[PDB]
């Protein structure tokens, strides 16, 4: 669309001459170089910054190019051709496609924000790359660092690039999953440590009624085999921890039948 401010990208005013441009590029290229910044977002910023330096090089090309945006309308191309020597201008931004046009694709790396449910199911999905269209599927049972490589669906080029869609396992609000074990707090009143009762525990399988053994001390984990978290190497069980709480709503009958063991605790 309209011109993204290359001056604001570099950090120089509108009227800044060639030397300020040089001393801004030589700092950004020294910071956003892909080798010195091993991050997905660094590559596009490096491309845009060297693209900014491409049209900011010499005073004649300064006048010819950097009048774009200043002019009342983008003027027609000047005669005699251009000079883009020493620059990889074959993957410039959409603005240069708009203005002039002439341009192996890159393995576009991005992140898929996936919760426990979406990661467990996977399935068909419309992935969101920056600007263009793409849609790939996630297999059920995805884990951290999965390499979702789809040939011919990533970066634009000849040949087109592939995808590196790393899954960011979203922290489920009440589900704290570390590795393949869910440290989900299971709050339950005290009397289950006398006989052993049922609790409507919510897991990835849904709401399930869970039994407990009597005289279970607080802080104990209980294995869930057959209903854990299946994955690529098997069914990763979920070890939820028990915790003893108090009935928040008490009756006068509760006080009357509780006085005896209150005295018992007073003694022991």
């Amino acid at each position: 669309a309209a011109k993204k401010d290359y001056y604001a990208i570099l950090g120089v005013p509108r009227n800044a001459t060639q030397e300020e441009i040089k001393r801004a590029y030589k700092r950004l290229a020294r910071q956003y170089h892909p080798d010195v910044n091993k991050s997905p977002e660094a590559e596009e910023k490096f491309k845009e910054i060297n693209e900014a330096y491409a049209v900011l090089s010499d005073p004649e090309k300064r006048r010819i190019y950097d009048t774009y945006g200043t002019t009342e309308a983008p003027p027609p191309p000047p005669p005699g051709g251009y000079d883009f020597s020493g620059f990889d201008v074959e993957d410039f931004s959409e603005f240069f496609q708009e203005l002039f046009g002439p341009g192996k694709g890159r393995d576009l790396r991005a992140e898929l924000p996936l919760t426990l449910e979406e990661a467990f199911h996977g399935g068909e999905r419309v992935v969101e790359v920056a600007g263009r269209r793409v849609s790939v599927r996630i297999p059920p049972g995805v884990r951290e660092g999965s390499v979702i490589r789809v040939p011919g669906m990533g970066g634009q080029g000849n040949p087109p690039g592939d995808l590196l869609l790393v899954v960011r396992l979203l922290p489920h609000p009440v589900f704290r999953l570390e590795g393949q074990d869910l440290y989900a707090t299971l709050d339950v009143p005290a009397p289950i440590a006398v006989v052993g009762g049922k609790v409507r525990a919510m897991t990835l399988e849904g709401p399930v009624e869970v039994a407990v053994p009597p005289r279970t001390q607080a802080g104990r984990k209980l294995r869930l085999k057959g209903k854990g978290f299946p994955g690529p190497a098997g069914r990763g069980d979920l070890y939820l921890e028990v915790r003893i709480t108090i009935p928040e709503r008490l009756t006068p009958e509760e006080e009357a039948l509780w006085k005896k063991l209150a005295e018992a605790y007073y003694a022991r």
Binding site: E19, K22, R23, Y25, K26, R27, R30, Q31, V36
Partner: protein, 77 residues
């Protein structure tokens, strides 16, 4: 009734053992941004400490752009 914070002029460089030509080379590559208006260059106290670190890594090797290993180093901390 004027506070003495400001910046540091080209006078303290000799106290810090930093040649003016080296400051020129650092400035024209973007290692540090001075204040030109309206006379000479001017820098912050920790701005003069960055090429002070940089001019101590020149004691073995190599060329002027050791600030590249410094910009990462301050980004390393």
């Amino acid at each position: 009734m004027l506070a003495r914070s400001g910046w540091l002029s080209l006078e303290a460089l000799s106290e810090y053992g930093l040649s003016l030509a080296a400051v020129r080379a650092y400035v024209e590559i973007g290692f540090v941004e001075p204040l030109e208006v309206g006379g000479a260059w001017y820098f912050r106290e920790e701005d003069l400490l960055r090429m002070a670190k940089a001019e101590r890594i020149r004691k073995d090797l190599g060329a002027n752009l050791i600030g590249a290993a410094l910009v990462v180093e301050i980004l390393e901390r």
